[PDB]
Design an enzyme around this catalytic site. Sequence first.
Site, short mmCIF file in Angstrom:
data_model
loop_
_atom_site.label_atom_id
_atom_site.label_comp_id
_atom_site.label_asym_id
_atom_site.label_seq_id
_atom_site.Cartn_x
_atom_site.Cartn_y
_atom_site.Cartn_z
N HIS A 61 -23.32 -67.06 41.61
CA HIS A 61 -22.81 -65.92 40.85
C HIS A 61 -23.90 -65.14 40.13
O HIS A 61 -23.70 -63.95 39.85
CB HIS A 61 -21.67 -66.31 39.89
CG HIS A 61 -21.95 -67.48 39.01
ND1 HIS A 61 -22.50 -67.36 37.75
CD2 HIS A 61 -21.70 -68.80 39.18
CE1 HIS A 61 -22.59 -68.56 37.19
NE2 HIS A 61 -22.12 -69.45 38.04
N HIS A 91 -30.00 -65.39 32.31
CA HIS A 91 -29.59 -64.81 33.58
C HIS A 91 -29.25 -63.35 33.34
O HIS A 91 -29.26 -62.86 32.21
CB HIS A 91 -28.40 -65.56 34.16
CG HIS A 91 -27.23 -65.50 33.25
ND1 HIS A 91 -27.04 -66.41 32.23
CD2 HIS A 91 -26.25 -64.59 33.14
CE1 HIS A 91 -25.97 -66.08 31.54
NE2 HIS A 91 -25.48 -64.97 32.07
N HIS A 93 -26.63 -59.85 34.71
CA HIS A 93 -25.54 -59.25 35.48
C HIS A 93 -25.98 -57.86 35.88
O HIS A 93 -26.62 -57.16 35.09
CB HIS A 93 -24.26 -59.15 34.65
CG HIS A 93 -23.84 -60.45 34.05
ND1 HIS A 93 -22.90 -61.28 34.63
CD2 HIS A 93 -24.27 -61.08 32.94
CE1 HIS A 93 -22.76 -62.36 33.88
NE2 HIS A 93 -23.58 -62.26 32.86
N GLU A 103 -22.22 -55.73 31.30
CA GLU A 103 -20.94 -56.28 30.89
C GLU A 103 -20.45 -55.59 29.62
O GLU A 103 -19.39 -54.95 29.63
CB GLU A 103 -21.07 -57.80 30.70
CG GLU A 103 -21.37 -58.45 32.03
CD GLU A 103 -20.93 -59.87 32.11
OE1 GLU A 103 -21.30 -60.67 31.21
OE2 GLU A 103 -20.20 -60.20 33.07
N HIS A 116 -28.75 -61.94 29.56
CA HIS A 116 -28.16 -62.86 28.60
C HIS A 116 -29.07 -64.06 28.40
O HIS A 116 -29.28 -64.83 29.34
CB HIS A 116 -26.80 -63.32 29.09
CG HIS A 116 -25.78 -62.23 29.07
ND1 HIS A 116 -24.62 -62.29 29.81
CD2 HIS A 116 -25.74 -61.06 28.41
CE1 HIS A 116 -23.90 -61.20 29.61
NE2 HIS A 116 -24.55 -60.44 28.74
N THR A 195 -18.55 -64.98 29.53
CA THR A 195 -18.01 -63.93 30.38
C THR A 195 -17.74 -64.39 31.81
O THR A 195 -17.33 -63.56 32.63
CB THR A 195 -18.95 -62.71 30.42
OG1 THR A 195 -20.15 -63.04 31.12
CG2 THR A 195 -19.27 -62.20 28.99
N1 LIG Z 1 -22.25 -64.77 30.95
S1 LIG Z 1 -22.44 -65.63 29.52
O1 LIG Z 1 -21.38 -65.33 28.62
O2 LIG Z 1 -23.70 -65.32 28.93
C1 LIG Z 1 -22.39 -67.47 29.95
C2 LIG Z 1 -21.41 -68.03 30.80
C3 LIG Z 1 -21.37 -69.42 31.13
C4 LIG Z 1 -22.34 -70.32 30.61
C5 LIG Z 1 -22.33 -71.86 30.95
N2 LIG Z 1 -21.45 -72.23 32.10
C6 LIG Z 1 -20.28 -73.04 32.03
O3 LIG Z 1 -19.94 -73.50 30.92
C7 LIG Z 1 -19.38 -73.41 33.29
O4 LIG Z 1 -18.78 -74.73 33.27
C8 LIG Z 1 -17.95 -75.15 34.35
C9 LIG Z 1 -17.35 -74.16 35.20
C10 LIG Z 1 -16.52 -74.59 36.28
C11 LIG Z 1 -16.24 -76.00 36.56
C12 LIG Z 1 -15.36 -76.45 37.70
C13 LIG Z 1 -15.06 -77.81 37.89
C14 LIG Z 1 -15.59 -78.76 36.93
O5 LIG Z 1 -15.23 -79.95 36.87
O6 LIG Z 1 -16.57 -78.34 36.00
C15 LIG Z 1 -16.82 -76.97 35.74
C16 LIG Z 1 -17.69 -76.53 34.61
C17 LIG Z 1 -23.32 -69.77 29.76
C18 LIG Z 1 -23.34 -68.39 29.45
ZN LIG Z 2 -23.94 -63.66 31.31
#
Ligand SMILES: NS(=O)(=O)c1ccc(CNC(=O)COc2ccc3ccc(=O)oc3c2)cc1
Ligand SMILES: [Zn+2]
Length: 257
Positions: A61, A91, A93, A103, A116, A195
């Site tokens: 992603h 990372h 977007h 975003e 971010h 997000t």
């Molecule tokens: N764009 S942002 O706001 O800056 C931003 C966005 C995200 C993060 C950290 N990422 C997470 O937390 C994802 O965690 C997960 C997702 C899916 C599964 C599916 C099955 C499972 O068992 O585990 C999972 C665990 C940091 C910053």
């Molecule tokens: Zn982000």
Amino acid sequence: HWGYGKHNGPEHWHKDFPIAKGERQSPVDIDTHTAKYDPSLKPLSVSYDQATSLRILNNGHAFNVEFDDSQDKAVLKGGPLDGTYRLIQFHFHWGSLDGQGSEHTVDKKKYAAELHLVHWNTKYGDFGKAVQQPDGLAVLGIFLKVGSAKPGLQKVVDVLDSIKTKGKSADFTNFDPRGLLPESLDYWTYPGSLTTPPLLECVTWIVLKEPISVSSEQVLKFRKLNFNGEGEPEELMVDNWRPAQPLKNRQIKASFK
Ligand SMILES: NS(=O)(=O)c1ccc(CNC(=O)COc2ccc3ccc(=O)oc3c2)cc1
Ligand SMILES: [Zn+2]
């Protein structure tokens, strides 16, 4: 599984992640005339001199530049924050064209991309525990506009050929994230969420007012990445942004007059 396509994009995420319709979702539009100067806000303290980058990963992603967060090396403090937040990754977007990609928006203006820098509150011990707390994360958001090249970004751009597809990673040591900051640290701040799924409502958002400039060639290289894995039909990694969400019962505060 979730993504950014017509059949699995942001409009669909609420079915597996009902918090998508919650009370403090991100990103949001920043209405500059309605955000109030808060003189009680402090200047941001960005201490990246000892940052230790390790690896760059295409996760299907975006791509993450990962840091050693086993010790207080690169930390964010001050501003709206209480305590110490450790840098774990950054990372971006971005869009398929320069007219979209960010975003957050500013008076409905979309930037070409958004950086971010993700930090977690050390009082919770580890990232997985921090994301379960309302004050668990601090994300520093920085807009990218297309113009002059950003010299400090070129080492990121030149490694992307080696992580073209989902699941690929490459060693990425000694990268200095101070080269990605603008001159001014004036900011807006509000309480929000991740997000991307799981969309947890654990983020203090700190969005810098001054964007950084990157060149058209630099962002064109972002757009050559792939959402798919090796050997699969090519789906260009573009438009990996969530649109603005309802502000609801939240105030955006400005660090500056
Ligand atoms: N764009 S942002 O706001 O800056 C931003 C966005 C995200 C993060 C950290 N990422 C997470 O937390 C994802 O965690 C997960 C997702 C899916 C599964 C599916 C099955 C499972 O068992 O585990 C999972 C665990 C940091 C910053
Ligand atoms: Zn982000």
